[PDB]
């Protein structure tokens, strides 16, 4: 054995060994229990970041842990290759997004390989490849025919100068990011997934995810935003009919989730586009100007100032006769149902602020205990939906929320003035992107037949990769060699859709493609979907906790309903790794290039998440080059729990390295002192106290690491536990024949316990210790016998009893009360 730890030498040799044994290239082996461990696949945007490495090391520790326990582990990787990063790289550097993408894939994959993750590179996918996206085109066509995907006009932000559709992330104060020109709102036909048809399924199925973080489930519940409420109609008054036609002449309709407060309404509010708004804004230009301000302006709703103007029109509350004025209010949106709401200032906080601004009335209709009500100050309990009881509500006084709900539902229904209704904040999923580098939408536009889907055997619609976009509209709409085609229905001349898909589509089903990424007759082969089932463990950042996860669960249910898979939920367990943060320097300098206290130094600034913004993300390549993959993986698993933020630390990197030198040194000095022997096993009576204690430390450590890997998923404490065993080992004379056998038992366990964290050094040290295959020896066992510890009358002594080392004060006093009560354990039990 070489005396000194050389990671730059041991690490490539170990990866070659693993690659040559194909331990990570798995099949659908029915003679082994499957384990599907998945880390969120990256955008190939150039080079791996330190955050990447943390995410993917975590996935690797869990995959390697399951593999040592005999599982058939699939840990796939791949490239979420479509989207804007490549388009800007095309604009900025005069190159095709495809070739820029494959260049990045090559570099990053080599980076990922050098970290030694146990990945099935035979299941790699690149989502920008026709091989992949043809199947999401296929699914699009099948759902389009069912109406699950549909086409209708939607609003986009048009920049008149750049001549391109803008996302709201690029419209700043109403103007184009790279232009400042005033943005126009234009109607254009776009494609949508009817995700609202699955809202109830997507909500209730969260209850099945017992192994998801509760906050992630809460974020999804709040996004779907289900509410059970009441449709309520207020008959338009006799004096307020001018210009009103149809049903709008008859009643103002409203959705409320608090119909138990209907007797406390003091006004109503309609959107600027509501017919009662535009009808009262005829002889009243003051309202015409407010209506103008509104369509000029959920994201900003909380932050914005709530404004309204009176209307002079009136409606009648169907429950208590009251005639209440309508208002036009900027907070009422035209499209979220009725476009009109009631207002109960005494029990809704926004209605309170609105009514306090304009001095509008507020009427208590709910009291909570003896809580004092004061109309001039809002208190949290005004909105209490659980401990309130109805006040000033005549026939409803004394009821609680649900009974009043059911009562007003019965009253309104019996008078025809309302009915219960379920609403959702969830909107349909808009697919269309007016950009180049993304999956083409498989629709052909024909003047006779309409918009028609591309037949299955004509898929894929191939995206031309010989394209350099220039931010002046999508190049596809200027490429007749792409959009000119024939109609698949009638054969006449026709045009391809030139919009591309939301790149969330690719990441909504890639976990299924991984099961059979060369299947050519469908999204995923039946045989593979049956074997792998669902992802047992998913690891990714919290920024994807809402949209990506909801889209992925939605696609899972769509694919199941198509008979392609037989699971309801894609991800069983979910782990959210914390960010990696790092000091900043300064414009801004990368930390690997600084005068750490060119010539005059820089300013040591603040610590924040590694990013391009402040140029503070350390290249994991400089870290691998300088210390090796195992030091990188060890540092990140040791510094903090995986969920906590990780602070970049030079001394922490050094400390991980020195610990690996120590592990190396410990094994060498053991084999220097007499070579390998058979590890201690079996009954341990006759072993010395010192060796019994070391074996106790050993098997306690195996139990704790197994729990930390398996149940708690806290790897930093697992490493600390293995450090304590080594410290104990260092304080133990293991020179005797029995001592050498226990020493071999300790080092053989420690090397396997750490193998998921630092597999290169542990693989190398293991083969110096033992001649078997490490993955066939498997995860260390807990020897329960090693955990059992040895056993330890009014004055004059009268007997003696054998006690368990874990016997409580009640057991000493019990055994004392049985031999032929003050108790000092280990010494005497004295019965007065
Ligand atoms: C499933 C897809 C929608 C994922 C998508 N390709 C993506 O986020 N791609 S990504 O490449 O941006 O990130 C891939 C994963 O790596 C983590 N990561 C990445 C960079 C960093 O600085 N910090 C950090 O933690 C990040 O949370 C995520 O889980
Ligand atoms: Mg269950
Ligand atoms: Zn046609």
Please give the full DSSP string across 484-550, using - where no structure is assigned: EEE-TTT-SEEEE---EE-TTTGGGTHHHHTTSTT-SSSSS-HHHHHHH-SEEEEE--GGGTTHHHH
d(CA 751, CA 736): 22
Contact (CB, 8 A) for 318 and 418 = yes
Secondary structure (DSSP) of 40-56: PPPP-SSS--HHHHHHH
306 lines ligand 1 (CB under 6 A): no
**From the CB of residue 161, how many other CB atoms can be counted at a distance below 10 Å?**
12
85 lines ligand 1 (CB under 6 A): no
d(CA 730, CA 662): 11
Alpha helical stretches, state H, 22-161:
50-68, 84-93, 97-114, 130-146
Q: Tell me, in angstroms, the distance from the centre of ligand 2 to residue 31's CA.
A: 24
Q: Give the rounded distance of the alpha carbon of 422 from its chain centre.
A: 27
Q: Tell me, in angstroms, the distance from the centre of ligand 3 to residue 259's CA.
A: 52
**DSSP assignment letter at 711:** I
d(CA 808, CA 787): 18
d(CA 66, CA 69): 5
Contact (CB, 8 A) for 500 and 435 = yes
Q: Tell me, in angstroms, the distance from the centre of ligand 2 to residue 534's CA.
A: 12
Q: Tell me, in angstroms, the distance from the centre of ligand 1 to residue 167's CA.
A: 21
Which numbered atom of ligand 1 lies nearest the CA of 50? 22
d(CA 498, CA 434): 8
Of all protein residues, the one whose alpha carbon is nearest to atom 5 of ligand 1 is: 42
52 lines ligand 1 (CB under 6 A): yes
Which numbered atom of ligand 1 lies nearest the CA of 510? 1
Q: Is 604 exposed, middle or buried (0-12, 13-18, 19+ CB in 10 A)?
A: middle
Of 510, 525, 600, the closest CA to residue 566 belongs to 525
Q: Tell me, in angstroms, the distance from the centre of ligand 3 to residue 494's CA.
A: 7
What's the Cα-to-Cα distance from 230 to each of 224, 271, 321, 341, 555, rounded to whole Å?
A: 18, 19, 18, 11, 31
SS3 label, residue 446: strand
d(CA 501, CA 478): 18
Q: Tell me, in angstroms, the distance from the centre of ligand 1 to residue 642's CA.
A: 15
Q: List the resolution, Å.
A: 2.3
Of 190, 144, 173, 193, the closest CA to residue 434 belongs to 190
What sign results for the dihedral spanned by CA atoms 335, 337, 340, 342? negative
SS3 label, residue 808: coil
**From the CB of residue 77, how many other CB atoms can be counted at a distance below 10 Å?**
22
What sign results for the dihedral spanned by CA atoms 148, 151, 156, 162? positive
User: Ligand nearest 209 Cα, by number?
Assistant: 2
d(CA 235, CA 232): 10
Q: Which of 38, 46, 52 for a ligand 1 pocket mutation test, highest count of atoms within 8 Å of Cβ?
A: 52
d(CA 817, CA 827): 16
544 lines ligand 1 (CB under 6 A): yes
Q: Determination technique for this PDB entry?
A: X-ray
Contact (CB, 8 A) for 668 and 747 = no
Q: Tell me, in angstroms, the distance from the centre of ligand 2 to residue 217's CA.
A: 15
Q: Tell me, in angstroms, the distance from the centre of ligand 1 to residue 192's CA.
A: 26
Phi, psi of 140 (to 5 degrees): -55, -50
d(CA 651, CA 306): 53
Tokens of 143: 């759902």
Q: Tell me, in angstroms, the distance from the centre of ligand 2 to residue 211's CA.
A: 9
User: Ligand nearest 451 Cα, by number?
Assistant: 3
Q: Tell me, in angstroms, the distance from the centre of ligand 1 to residue 542's CA.
A: 9
SS3 label, residue 747: helix
577 lines ligand 1 (CB under 6 A): yes
Q: Tell me, in angstroms, the distance from the centre of ligand 1 to residue 534's CA.
A: 21
Spatial CB neighbours of 767, under 8 Å, sequence gap ≥ 6: 774
Q: Tell me, in angstroms, the distance from the centre of ligand 1 to residue 692's CA.
A: 47
User: Ligand nearest 56 Cα, by number?
Assistant: 1
Q: Which of 51, 111, 578 for a ligand 1 pocket mutation test, highest count of atoms within 8 Å of Cβ?
A: 51
d(CA 634, CA 245): 73
Ligand 3 is an ion; residues with CB less than 5 A from it? 446, 448-449, 487, 489-490, 492
80 lines ligand 1 (CB under 6 A): yes
Q: Which of 50, 54, 55, 510 for a ligand 1 pocket mutation test, highest count of atoms within 8 Å of Cβ?
A: 55
Tokens of 643: 């969920």
Which numbered atom of ligand 1 lies nearest the CA of 577? 25
Q: Which of 126, 538, 540 for a ligand 1 pocket mutation test, highest count of atoms within 8 Å of Cβ?
A: 540
Q: Tell me, in angstroms, the distance from the centre of ligand 1 to residue 503's CA.
A: 14
Of all protein residues, the one whose alpha carbon is nearest to atom 22 of ligand 1 is: 51
548 lines ligand 1 (CB under 6 A): yes
What sign results for the dihedral spanned by CA atoms 609, 613, 618, 621? positive
What sign results for the dihedral spanned by CA atoms 164, 169, 170, 172? positive
Spatial CB neighbours of 283, under 8 Å, sequence gap ≥ 6: none
SS3 label, residue 363: coil
Which numbered atom of ligand 1 lies nearest the CA of 42? 11
d(CA 220, CA 307): 30
49 lines ligand 1 (CB under 6 A): yes
Q: Which of 39, 40, 81 for a ligand 1 pocket mutation test, highest count of atoms within 8 Å of Cβ?
A: 40
51 lines ligand 1 (CB under 6 A): yes
Of all protein residues, the one whose alpha carbon is nearest to atom 7 of ligand 1 is: 42
Q: Tell me, in angstroms, the distance from the centre of ligand 2 to residue 69's CA.
A: 22
Secondary structure (DSSP) of 620-665: HHHHHHHH-HHHHHHHHHHHS-TTS-EE--HHHHHHHHHHHHHHHH
- Can you give the C-alpha Rg of the chain in angstroms? 34
d(CA 436, CA 499): 8
User: Ligand nearest 444 Cα, by number?
Assistant: 3
Of all protein residues, the one whose alpha carbon is nearest to atom 25 of ligand 1 is: 51
Which numbered atom of ligand 1 lies nearest the CA of 56? 16
41 lines ligand 1 (CB under 6 A): yes
Which numbered atom of ligand 1 lies nearest the CA of 49? 22
SS3 label, residue 291: helix
Tokens of 397: 């006084």
Exposure pattern of 504-522 as b/e (b: 16+ CB <10 Å)? bbbbbbbbbbbbbbebeeb
Of all protein residues, the one whose alpha carbon is nearest to atom 8 of ligand 1 is: 42
CA angle 722–728–731, rounded 5-degree value = 145
Which numbered atom of ligand 1 lies nearest the CA of 609? 22
42 lines ligand 1 (CB under 6 A): yes
d(CA 752, CA 770): 12
Q: Tell me, in angstroms, the distance from the centre of ligand 3 to residue 479's CA.
A: 21
Q: Tell me, in angstroms, the distance from the centre of ligand 1 to residue 615's CA.
A: 18
Which numbered atom of ligand 1 lies nearest the CA of 541? 27
Q: How close are the terminal C-alpha atoms of the chain, in Å?
A: 66
SS3 label, residue 667: helix
43 lines ligand 1 (CB under 6 A): yes
Exposure pattern of 453-462 as b/e (b: 16+ CB <10 Å)? bbeeeebbbe
Which numbered atom of ligand 1 lies nearest the CA of 54? 25
User: Ligand nearest 573 Cα, by number?
Assistant: 2
d(CA 549, CA 224): 12
d(CA 639, CA 485): 58
Of all protein residues, the one whose alpha carbon is nearest to atom 27 of ligand 1 is: 541
Of all protein residues, the one whose alpha carbon is nearest to atom 1 of ligand 1 is: 40
């Amino acid at each position: 054995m070489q005396e000194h730890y050389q990671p730059a030498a041991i690490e490539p040799a170990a990866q070659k060994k693993w690659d040559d044994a194909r331990i990570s290239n798995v099949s659908e082996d029915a003679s082994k229990p499957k384990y599907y461990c998945l880390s969120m696949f990256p955008y190939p945007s150039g080079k791996l970041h330190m955050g990447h490495v943390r995410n993917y090391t975590i996935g690797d520790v869990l995959s390697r842990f399951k593999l040592l326990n005999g599982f058939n582990v699939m840990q796939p990787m791949g490239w979420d290759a479509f989207g804007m990063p490549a388009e800007n790289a095309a604009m900025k550097n005069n190159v095709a997004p495809a070739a820029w993408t494959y260049d990045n894939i090559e570099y990053m994959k080599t980076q990922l390989k050098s970290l030694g993750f146990a990945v099935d590179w035979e299941r790699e996918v690149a989502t920008c490849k026709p091989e992949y996206y043809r199947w999401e085109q296929w699914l699009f066509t099948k759902l389009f025919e069912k109406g699950i995907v549909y086409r209708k006009n939607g609003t986009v932000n048009w920049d008149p100068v750049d001549q391109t559709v803008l996302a709201n992330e690029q419209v700043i104060d109403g103007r184009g990011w790279r232009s400042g020109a005033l943005i126009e709102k234009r109607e254009i036909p776009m494609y949508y997934f009817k995700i609202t048809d699955y809202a109830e399924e997507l909500l209730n199925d969260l209850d099945k995810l017992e192994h998801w973080p509760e906050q992630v489930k809460t974020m999804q519940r709040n996004w779907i935003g289900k509410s059970r409420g009441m449709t309520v109609r207020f008959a338009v008054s006799d004096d307020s009919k001018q210009g009103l036609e149809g049903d709008y002449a008859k009643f103002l309709q409203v959705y409320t989730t608090r119909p138990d407060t209907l007797m406390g309404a003091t006004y109503v509010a309609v959107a600027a586009e509501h017919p009662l708004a535009t009808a009262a804004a005829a002889d009243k230009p003051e309202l015409q100007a407010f209506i103008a301000e509104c369509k000029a302006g959920e994201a900003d709703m909380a932050t914005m100032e709530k404004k309204g103007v009176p209307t002079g029109r009136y409606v009648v509350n169907p429950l208590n006769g009251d005639k209440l004025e309508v208002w036009i209010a900027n907070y009422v949106l035209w499209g979220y149902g009725d476009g009109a709401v009631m207002a109960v200032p005494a029990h809704d906080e926004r209605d309170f602020e609105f009514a306090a601004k304009y001095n509008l009335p507020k009427k208590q209709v709910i009291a909570v205990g003896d809580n004092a009500f004061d109309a001039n100050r809002w208190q949290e309990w005004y909105g209490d939906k659980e401990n309130g009881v109805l006040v000033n509500s005549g026939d409803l006084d004394g009821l609680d929320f649900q009974t009043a709900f059911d009562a007003v539902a019965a009253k309104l229904q019996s008078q025809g003035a309302g009915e219960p209704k379920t609403q959702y904040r969830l909107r349909d999923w808009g697919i269309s992107r007016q950009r180049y580098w993304g999956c083409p939408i498989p629709i052909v536009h024909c003047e006779k037949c309409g918009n028609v889907p591309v037949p299955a055997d004509q898929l894929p619609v191939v995206l031309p990769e010989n394209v350099v976009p220039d931010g002046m509209g999508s190049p596809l709409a200027k490429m007749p060699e792409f959009y000119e085609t024939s109609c698949p229905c009638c054969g006449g001349a026709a045009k391809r859709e030139t919009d591309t898909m939301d790149t969330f589509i690719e990441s909504s089903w890639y976990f299924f493609r991984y099961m059979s990424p060369k299947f050519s007759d469908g999204m995923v082969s039946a045989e593979s979907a049956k074997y792998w089932g669902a992802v047992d463990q998913y690891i990714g950042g919290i920024e994807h906790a809402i949209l990506h996860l909801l889209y992925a669960r939605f696609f899972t249910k769509l694919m199941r309903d198509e008979g392609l898979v037989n699971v309801d939920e894609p991800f069983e367990r979910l782990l959210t790794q914390g960010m990696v943060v790092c000091e900043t320097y300064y414009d801004w300098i990368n930390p690997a290039d600084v005068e750490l206290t060119d010539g005059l130094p820089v300013v040591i600034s603040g610590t924040e998440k590694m990013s391009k913004s402040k140029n503070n993300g350390v290249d994991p390549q400089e870290l691998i080059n300088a210390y090796g993959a195992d030091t990188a993986r060890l540092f990140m698993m040791f510094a903090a729990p995986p969920e906590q933020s990780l602070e970049w630390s030079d001394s922490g990197v050094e400390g991980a390295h020195r610990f690996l030198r120590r592990l190396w040194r410990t094994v060498y000095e053991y084999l220097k002192q007499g070579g390998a022997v058979k590890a201690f096993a079996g009954n341990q009576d006759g072993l010395s106290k010192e060796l019994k204690d070391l074996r106790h430390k050993l098997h306690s450590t195996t139990a704790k690491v197994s729990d930390d890997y398996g149940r708690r998923q806290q790897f930093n404490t697992a490493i600390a536990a293995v450090m304590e065993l080594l410290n104990q080992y260092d304080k133990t004379d293991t020179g005797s024949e029995q001592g050498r056998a226990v020493a071999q038992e300790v080092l053989e366990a420690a090397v396997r316990l750490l193998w998921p964290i630092v597999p290169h050094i542990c693989e190398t040290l293991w083969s110096e210790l033992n001649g078997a295959k490490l993955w066939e020896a498997g995860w260390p066992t807990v020897d329960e016998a090693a955990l059992v510890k040895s056993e330890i009358v009014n004055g004059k002594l009268r007997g003696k009893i054998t006690v368990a080392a874990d016997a409580s004060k009640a057991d000493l006093e019990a055994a004392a009360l049985a031999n032929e009560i003050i108790v000092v354990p280990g010494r005497l039990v004295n019965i007065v």
